[PDB]
């Protein structure tokens, strides 16, 4: 009764150890969610095997085929018993899977090259000298579109029609575009990923302002899992105990490069 | 067999009906959490008695006595089986009681008298001609103490050492102070209460800006309640079904006045 854990390769949640070819099983991996899985496993009392989600995806309905992909699909279709990953708690996913209480809280945020005279989304909306965009598809792009909040709809008005296109294909593209643009491009992305980059060499980016919305990552189990309650109580206790905060400090700041 | 529901009189969550002296039992009360209690009950299959928390409080641990007051205390000390109320999910409360998934999302927000040239917290930070404050003790002032976001810490720098005192003794004081100052005082309070007041006569306040943090209201049960699981699944399904949004629309906007 070894529990199959599905997860995803995304720094610093799960990463390959430098010498991973020499190692086997769970020892190939390290990261925030590697450590979290061990704590949850400990608290619930199960042995487990970490597996990387086959298709590299978090989980969406292939839009017109009704079939779930990513880690969600691995749970609904019985290929994994638990997902321990930065998986966003959403209502469409709650229709088919269960989430624990959030193990991390995050939201959309602004990344700038340090010295950029921007402090907030309002600041970006009021001005055109500094360009700004988001990933070229995903929740952050989707959030600005369907927002009705005036500051956010003005931002969508600007980004949708800007030329050259202010959207980027990957997080790495957005970040390179911030560092290369002399402080005249700003990037909208998840605060956790933003705080992670601000601790990476060459330490020239910074997160500014408060977050623009409220999301959480939760641990997911298939509906009717016998683990659901035990997992939820583990997260609650790990959160109360400060362990979640200690793991965040370890992988973001202890293992950081800019402190 | 009848479960005791503790809740609090807080408009529009639970309110006395116009003719409450004429009625008995659960029919004396009405509101968002009155209707929610009915849905939770329906979904979980229990009869229930609505009772108003004896001391009118939400729940805190007296530092000197270790004793909980309010609805939290009524759950932990066995006076109630469930709280169905706008009770904030917090880490100190989760140590002693269980919360369902949130049935409502809210945050700190800015209430303005209409016509005040303020649109955001940053705006308030850059200026002093318009004063601004919060309740004189509680989570919102507390959030400003420990903030490290630049705009929010500059605000706290200002508010702590301001004269006359920008803090107020009750929400009625803060709201009356917004209406009394023709737009030269701004009040920081929960987004839900802010949106509620903006739909009530005399329709002179409004919520401005986005929320400053992320909080949630949850249904609470004593630790080890057999209802904990049923309630959580009920809230999830009511949320999925849109009932929580419909109840918000009903008590905030359908029954609004502006
Ligand atoms: O559940 C989800 N969890 C996610 C977790 C992450 C992060 F932890 F930051 F890695 C990200 N990153 C966004 C930045 O580029 C790399 C991936 C995306 C996620 N998405 C897709 P989105 O919400 O459309 O962006 C989900 O759906
Ligand atoms: O659980 C809690 N739920 C609360 C719910 C509300 C309301 F908004 F009415 F629903 C309020 N306020 C009274 C109305 O005007 C401002 C907000 C306070 C609450 N508090 C104390 P706080 O956290 O110090 O603010 C709690 O502890």
Numbering used by the authors:
A (entry chain A): 4 to 262
B (entry chain B): 4 to 261
From the paper:
AMPARs mediate fast excitatory signaling in the brain, and a change in their number or function underlies lasting forms of synaptic plasticity. AMPARs are homo- or heterotetrameric assemblies of the pore-forming subunits GluA1–4. The activation, deactivation, and desensitization of the receptor is controlled by ligand-binding domains (LBDs) which form a self-contained clamshell-like structure within each of the four subunits. Following glutamate binding, closure of the LBD clamshell around the agonist causes separation of the D2 domains, applying tension to linkers between the LBDs and the ion channel which opens the gate.
To test this, we introduced cysteines at sites on the central axis of the D2–D2 dimer interface, cross-linking of which has previously been shown to inhibit channel opening by trapping the receptor in desensitized-like states. Thus we compared S729C, cross-linking of which permits the relaxed dimer conformation, with G724C which we predicted would not accommodate the relaxed dimer conformation when cross-linked. Our functional data demonstrate that cross-linked GluA2(R) S729C/γ-2 receptors retain sensitivity to glutamate, implying that upon agonist binding they can undergo structural change which affects the channel gate. To understand the molecular basis of this, we determined the crystal structure of cross-linked S729C ligand binding cores in apo-like conformations bound to the competitive antagonists NBQX (diffracted to 1.8 Å resolution) or ZK200775 (diffracted to 2.0 Å). AMPAR gating is driven by the separation of the D2-M3 linker regions following agonist binding. Thus, binding of glutamate is known to increase the distance between the α-carbons of Proline 632 pairs at the base of the D2 lobe of the GluA2 LBD. For the cross-linked S729C mutant LBD bound with NBQX (S729CNBQX) the Proline 632 separation was 22.8 Å (similar to that seen with S729CZK, 22.6 Å). This is less than the separation we calculate for the glutamate-bound mutant LBD (S729Cglu, 26.4 Å). The fact that GluA2(R) S729C, co-expressed with auxiliary subunits and trapped in the relaxed dimer conformation by cross-linking, exhibited properties consistent with those of wild-type channels, demonstrates that this conformation does indeed mimic the behavior of the native desensitized receptor in the plasma membrane.
